């Protein structure tokens, strides 16, 4: 049949889901690794052993064990990113949408969720892939990987807890796509991985990792990049939090073997319930267990691999939102509220600044501070709040990404930069928060295109042509069509550094995104902190 | 007789000079100290021994031995600043302009010329006092003092050459006014010292120095401050420069007594011809022999005195011109030409900042560089040259002065702060230089009132109300005439820190003069340089 597909590990039976006026096929909850439980917690995935009979793949799988944001109970804006199914350690499954009728050898887009490496689900309504697969005639996969200590606890040296097993999870799913997408009419040669935030850092790290480079063709990165300050740790600091996690749970601490055996007997939510107590600073936009630079998944430092060009050469498409930081100030920084305008007394501004650059010394704090205040109007509660919003956005996403897009372009074969800044009309958060981190994703996944979600006609259009940009990029490596009258989105080149606005107005090209603050962030303050 | 006056040191006979279709009496080249010649070179002045007979005081006196600028031979724009009389170590003479008829007891303003403490004459055309004494009915005095090595060679411990003796020439002239001004109808209880650049710095340092506090009433400072980075040095630097001068002339360098011996046998121009070989770095806006923070004239460091309030509490009148640095880049930094727009390429721009901040470590260099660079336009010749202008303007005048005006206002009895930014219509220099360092002086001294000098009628008005500001402040301690119709120059207060624009247009009030750059130059960069 059409809804029956026979992979190299077993048969699976999908379901005919409707999407706008029509229907397509979906195969949800497909196993791709052996469940990682018991003795297998903190270890590299093992490929799912083959099954007999037909795997019922008609409902979403479980979500992985993860922290559950309860700051705003009932609030859709925060609830929409929480797990929506049961949470098991048995969670390494993927989902495929196939256009109906099944095409032969078509482009494949693998989605990779983010969530700071501490949270995120393959099964959220925002990652519902039926719209984009259908409208742009692509095969859409969305994978899953372990998060928090489950995915990234790291005792380098031990093979029982090496670290980066979450990235190894998503490489196994990619290797599953490589061997089975052809049985869904996916072309294993036209595979595009794409991810947001942690998921975008992840995309970046596969571009860098020699063990992952052959499992895909191209890459999209949204508001995330492999070199972000929150996105990695040294083995030493990785070890330290691993060890202190043992200390919170009154574990034996002499050797990794004893430590891990102690940590493997704890119920999963005992781990989640102390996961934040291992961070070295009072901070915003930092997460406890993240990828390690161990030397195996990452040959050397990310900077050196960028400099030597020791990475995958292909075309990348990538960009950032306008207000990356507003979400993280609302959760961790004083003076900000969901229900107020959040003007910020200057005293809170300093508290906010020291939170945003936890690692800086005093002199660097002053540099960050002088760099972002209007000294004709320092007690202006708005300019301070926008002040902080730009600090955490520029520090944690934008300037890290731009450093990556300049480094990569010296060696890549194509680069398209975007700047998404569309305040949705139906959005739930207050206006001060602007274009929220993560809220480009609705347009990528075509959610403006169903009329029951009450979007304006414009955001629909903008969603349809972002999907086309993404899809066309995934097919041809160029988001523009060759006929297509208007309006070509220019290559990003080392000398001219062009990019485009994603929003409801006619597209405009710009040069040097945030060059001024990014010189501060990528060259100067690094220099200040090294020498002081 | 009106032109014959009996002072405490002897009888003086003056001259009846015409002025603007009237006349007044001037007393020129009046001695106030013993000539500091032979064994008196480098030593503290001694009060002029009383003479017999009548001193023919109708001609200007000699100028001090000083460097002479030959960069543009014949060009009035620079020869305006060079000595216009013969030069001699016998140069310590003041000049008096008395209204006619003689006042009974009227205000006295004492001009203190600048010239980087290396140059300057009381007898320049632009310091002709007849116009302002005539127009605002004040007793105008114009003093002199040794400059460069003659005025500030500094070997602490040695009382044959202590340092600061150029400033002591000033104070001896100041006490001469104290004791004798009453005989010209001046009031020693209403004396206003005022000077420009090196002069303004000096005016500044008499309000610090205890031996000076009681020799005047008020203080006007123009484009100069005691705390200027070029305005002083330590004993250690002052001695090493004294010693390096001896090295440049084959002097005996074992003791000071032999050192100073050797130096007083050298002919004055032999000191001038090597003067500059002694600076520590290839720089701009720095000068060889300047005041020393010795512990006698200056009891402690300038900052401690500013913080502790250890200075004289009075009313000050001070301010700056719009483009203090343009003159100094024309003479010292690559790519500036007098006959060009001096569009600055970027490689010359950073030669510029290095020359501009000679004491900066490299980390300080990038700090300065990124704060004056439009990184969407780094090869914009204009903005680079405009940029470099601001750097040396802000670093050497603007921001030091604002530091002083805020430090002082915490303790004085009235601050009035100005921003001169009128480009004189008949200016000989090219327009890229703007409101050049030193060219408010023509308006202070009323030259636009001379018709043959071809100033615009609007320039005449600005000169007239500038001298009134100056003169009205010199008597009342306040620029304005109370309960009069003209718009009113507001006090500078610690909280609102207001100031006004001097120019042909109706008066504007502004707030915080160049705070953002000044926060950099006054709080952050100094902090950056302490650390390693
Ligand atoms: O901001 N400080 C705290 C803070 N408490 C809460 C309260 C609810 C769960 C607490 N869980 C967390 C803890 C800490 N940091 C966290 C950062 C982001 C997030 Cl979502 C949870 C964190 C550091 C160590 C203590 C726990 C919510 C947000 C929040 O930020
Ligand atoms: O920077 N302007 C002018 C400038 N002229 C020259 C030569 C022309 C006049 C000589 N006298 C000078 C010397 C030195 N530095 C000076 C700085 C400012 C002034 Cl006025 C005169 C200076 C450095 C050591 C050598 C002599 C050389 C370098 C230079 O920079
Ligand atoms: C597949 O699983 C769904 C989920 O409960 C169930 O409703 C459906 O009947 C199952 N189909 C078969 C053929 O087992
Ligand atoms: C990509 O590579 C091909 C062949 O290696 C080359 O001709 C083309 O110019 C490259 N394009 C870019 C944008 O790097
Ligand atoms: C003073 O000097 C001037 C300048 O030469 C001269 O004209 C005048 O007659 C002199 N007066 C006396 C009394 O010597
Ligand atoms: C100056 O001092 C007097 C008393 O000494 C005081 O009444 C007055 O307010 C002060 N003026 C200023 C401008 O500080
Ligand atoms: Cl200009």
Helix, strand or coil for residue A200?
A: helix
What is B320-368 written as a DSSP string? EETBTTHHHHHHHSTT--TTS--PPPHHHHHHHHHHHSTT--HHHHHHH
Identify all chain B residues contacting A366, using CB atoms and an 8 Å cutoff: 523-524, 527
Binding site membership of A15 for ligand 3 (Cβ less than 6 Å):
no
Pairing status of strand B509-511 against strand B498-502: antiparallel
Cα angle A16, A18, A20; round to 5: 155
C-alpha neighbours within 13 Å on the C-beta side of residue B125: 12
CA distance A59 to A30: 10
**By alpha-carbon position, which residue is closest to atom 12 of ligand 2?**
B276
A515 with B376: Cβ contact below 8 A: yes
Number of H helices, E strands in chain B: 19, 14
Which CATH code of 3.40.50.1820, 3.30.420.40, 3.40.50.450, 3.30.1370.110 fits the domain covering B1-532?
A: 3.40.50.1820
CA distance A218 to A215: 10
DSSP state at residue A456: -
Helix, strand or coil for residue B1?
A: coil
A359 a catalytic residue? no
Binding site membership of B493 for ligand 6 (Cβ less than 6 Å):
no
Residues paired with residue B413 on neighbouring β-strands, in sequence order? none
Helix, strand or coil for residue A220?
A: strand
Q: List the alpha helices (DSSP H) in A273-321.
A: 302-308
Any chain A CB within 8 A of the CB of B367?
yes
CA distance A458 to B413: 64
Cα–Cα nearest to B399, from B268, B521, B512, B301:
B521
Helix, strand or coil for residue B99?
A: coil
A516 with B376: Cβ contact below 8 A: yes
Residues paired with residue B110 on neighbouring β-strands, in sequence order? B141, B193
Indicate left, alpha or beta for B128 from its phi (over 0: left) and psi (-120 to 50: alpha).
beta
Cα–Cα nearest to B479, from A336, B471, B29:
B471
**Could you give the C-alpha distances from B15 to A43, A294, B26, B96, B137, in angstroms and in order?**
103, 91, 5, 11, 18
Q: Are A179 and A8 in contact (CB under 8 A)?
A: yes
Partner residue opposite A370 with nearest CB, options B366, B524, B532? B524
**By alpha-carbon position, which residue is closest to atom 3 of ligand 6?**
B413
Binding site membership of B434 for ligand 6 (Cβ less than 6 Å):
no
Partner residue opposite B532 with nearest CB, options A375, A515, A531? A531
CA distance B419 to B303: 24
**Could you give the C-alpha distances from B6 to B14, B43, B335, in angstroms and in order?**
11, 29, 56
Helix, strand or coil for residue A527?
A: helix
DSSP state at residue B415: E
B519 with A363: Cβ contact below 8 A: no
DSSP state at residue A316: E
Number of H helices, E strands in chain A: 18, 14
What is B21-80 written as a DSSP string? TEEEEEEEEEE-B----GGGTTSPP-B-PPP-SEEE--S--PBPS-----SSTT-HHHHT
Any chain A CB within 8 A of the CB of B274?
no
**Kind plus residue range of the DSSP H or E element containing B509:** strand B509-511
CA distance B358 to B281: 6
The contacts of residue B330 (CB under 8 Å, 6+ apart) are B336, B337, B338, B342, B433
CA distance A70 to A252: 32
DSSP state at residue B96: E
> Roughly how many angstroms between the first and final C-alpha of chain B, as a whole number?
70
CA distance A524 to A14: 54
The rounded Cα B242 to chain-centroid distance in angstroms is 23
**Kind plus residue range of the DSSP H or E element containing A319:** strand A316-321
Any chain A CB within 8 A of the CB of B380?
no
Write phi, then psi, for A55 (nearest 5 degrees): -75, 120
Indicate left, alpha or beta for A442 from its phi (over 0: left) and psi (-120 to 50: alpha).
alpha
CA distance B398 to B323: 9
Q: Are B419 and B320 in contact (CB under 8 A)?
A: yes
CA distance A303 to A297: 15
CA distance A82 to A278: 22
Min Cα–Cα distance to chain A from B336, Å? 26
Pairing status of strand B218-222 against strand B316-321: parallel
Binding site membership of B414 for ligand 6 (Cβ less than 6 Å):
yes
E-state strands within B70-203: 93-98, 106-112, 139-142, 186-196
The contacts of residue B478 (CB under 8 Å, 6+ apart) are B315, B414, B416, B472
Partner residue opposite B520 with nearest CB, options A370, A520, A523? A370
Q: Which residues of A140-168 are buried (b: 16+ CB within 10 A; e: fewer)?
A: bbbbbbbbbbbbbbbbbebebbbbbbbbb
Residues paired with residue B437 on neighbouring β-strands, in sequence order? none
Domain positions in chain A: 1-532
Q: Are B304 and B310 in contact (CB under 8 A)?
A: yes
**By alpha-carbon position, which residue is closest to atom 1 of ligand 5?**
B56
Q: List the alpha helices (DSSP H) in A141-255.
A: 148-152, 165-180, 198-208, 235-248
Helix pair angle (B165-180, B198-208), 10° resolution = 70
**Could you give the C-alpha distances from B408 to B107, B184, B314, B492, in angstroms and in order?**
24, 33, 10, 11
CA–centroid distance, A58 to ligand 3, in Å, is 7
**By alpha-carbon position, which residue is closest to atom 11 of ligand 6?**
B413
* HEC per residue, A161-180: CCCCHHHHHHHHHHHHHHHH
Q: Which ligand gives the minimal distance to the CA of A281?
A: 1
B512 with A366: Cβ contact below 8 A: no
* HEC per residue, A27-85: EEEEECECCCCHHHCCCCCCECCCCCCEEECCCCCCECCCCCCCCCCCCHHHHCCCCCC
Binding site membership of B413 for ligand 6 (Cβ less than 6 Å):
yes
CA distance B376 to B380: 9
Partner residue opposite B363 with nearest CB, options A511, A515, A531? A531
The number of the ligand 6 atom at minimal distance from the alpha carbon of B414 is 13
DSSP state at residue A505: S
C-alpha neighbours within 13 Å on the C-beta side of residue A235: 15
DSSP state at residue B127: G
Any chain B CB within 8 A of the CB of A496?
no
B532 with A532: Cβ contact below 8 A: yes
Any chain B CB within 8 A of the CB of A457?
no
Rg for chain B (alpha carbons), in Å?
22
Q: Are B192 and B324 in contact (CB under 8 A)?
A: no
The contacts of residue A442 (CB under 8 Å, 6+ apart) are A126, A424, A448, A463
CA distance B116 to A15: 88
Any chain B CB within 8 A of the CB of A363?
yes
DSSP state at residue B432: G
**Could you give the C-alpha distances from B300 to A402, B295, B308, in angstroms and in order?**
50, 6, 11
The contacts of residue B17 (CB under 8 Å, 6+ apart) are B23, B24, B25, B26, B130
Helix, strand or coil for residue B255?
A: coil
Checking chain A for breaks where C and the next N are over 2.5 Å apart, the residues before them are: none
Any chain A CB within 8 A of the CB of B528?
yes
Cα–Cα nearest to B344, from B290, B305, B389:
B389
Write phi, then psi, for A519 (nearest 5 degrees): -55, -50
**Resolution to 1 decimal place, in Å:** 2.9
Q: List the alpha helices (DSSP H) in A314-454.
A: 326-332, 346-356, 362-372, 381-393, 399-409, 441-444
Q: In what order do the strands lie in the sheet with A4-6?
A: A4-6, A11-13, A54-56
CA distance A452 to A131: 14
Pairing status of strand A509-511 against strand A498-502: antiparallel
**Kind plus residue range of the DSSP H or E element containing A95:** strand A93-98
Method: X-ray
């Amino acid at each position: 049949s059409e809804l029956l597909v026979n992979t190299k590990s077993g048969k699976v039976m999908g379901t005919r889901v409707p999407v706008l006026s029509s229907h397509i096929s979906a195969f949800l909850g497909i196993p791709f690794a052996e469940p990682p439980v018991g003795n297998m917690r903190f270890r590299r995935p093992e490929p799912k052993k083959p099954w007999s009979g037909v795997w019922n793949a008609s409902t979403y799988p479980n979500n992985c064990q993860q922290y559950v944001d309860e700051q705003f109970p009932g609030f859709s804006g925060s609830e929409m990113w929480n797990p929506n199914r049961e949470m098991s350690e048995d969670c390494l499954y993927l989902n495929i949408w196939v256009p109906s009728p099944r095409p032969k050898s078509t482009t494949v887009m693998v989605w990779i969720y983010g969530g700071g490496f501490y949270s995120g689900s393959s099964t959220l309504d925002v990652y519902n892939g039926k719209y984009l697969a259908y409208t742009e005639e692509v095969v859409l996969v969305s994978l899953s990987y372990r998060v928090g200590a489950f995915g990234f606890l790291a005792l380098h040296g031990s093979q029982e807890a090496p670290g980066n097993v979450g990235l190894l999870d998503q490489r196994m799913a990619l290797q599953w796509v490589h061997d089975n997408i052809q049985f869904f009419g996916g072309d294993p040669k036209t595979v595009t991985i794409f991810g947001e935030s942690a998921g975008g850092a992840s995309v970046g790290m596969h571009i860098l990792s020699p063990g992952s480079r052959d499992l895909f063709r191209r890459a999209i990165l949204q508001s995330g990049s492999p070199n972000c300050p929150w996105a990695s740790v040294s083995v030493a600091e990785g070890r330290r939090r691993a060890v202190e996690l043992g200390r919170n749970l009154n574990c034996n601490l002499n050797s990794d073997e004893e430590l891990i055996h102690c940590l493997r007997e704890k119920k999963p939510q005992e781990l989640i319930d102390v996961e934040w107590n291992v961070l070295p600073f009072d901070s915003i936009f930092r997460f406890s267990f993240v990828p390690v630079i161990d030397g195996e998944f990452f040959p050397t430092s990310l900077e050196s691999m960028l400099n030597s060009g020791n990475f995958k050469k292909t075309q990348i498409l990538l960009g950032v939102n306008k207000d990356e930081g507003s979400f993280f100030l609302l959760y961790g920084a004083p003076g900000f509220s969901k229900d107020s305008e959040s003007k910020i007394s200057r005293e809170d501004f300093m508290s906010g600044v020291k939170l945003s650059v936890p690692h800086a010394n005093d002199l660097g704090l002053d540099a960050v501070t002088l760099q972002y205040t209007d000294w004709m109007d320092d007690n202006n509660g708005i300019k301070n709040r926008d002040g902080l919003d730009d600090i955490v956005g520029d520090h944690n996403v934008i300037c890290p990404l731009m450093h990556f897009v300049n480094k990569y372009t010296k060696f890549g074969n194509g680069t398209y930069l975007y700047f998404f800044n569309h305040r949705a009309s139906n959005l739930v958060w207050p206006e001060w928060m602007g274009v929220i981190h993560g809220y480009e994703i609705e347009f990528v996944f075509g959610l403006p295109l169903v009329k029951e979600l009450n979007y304006t006609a414009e955001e629909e259009a903008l969603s349809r042509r972002i999907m086309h940009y993404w899809a066309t990029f995934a097919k041809t490596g160029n988001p523009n069509e060759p006929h297509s009258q208007e309006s070509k989105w220019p290559l990003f080149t080392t000398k001219e550094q062009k990019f485009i606005d994603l929003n409801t107005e006619p597209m405009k090209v710009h040069q040097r995104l945030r060059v001024q603050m990014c010189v501060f962030w990528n060259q100067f303050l690094p220099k200040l902190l090294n020498a002081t």
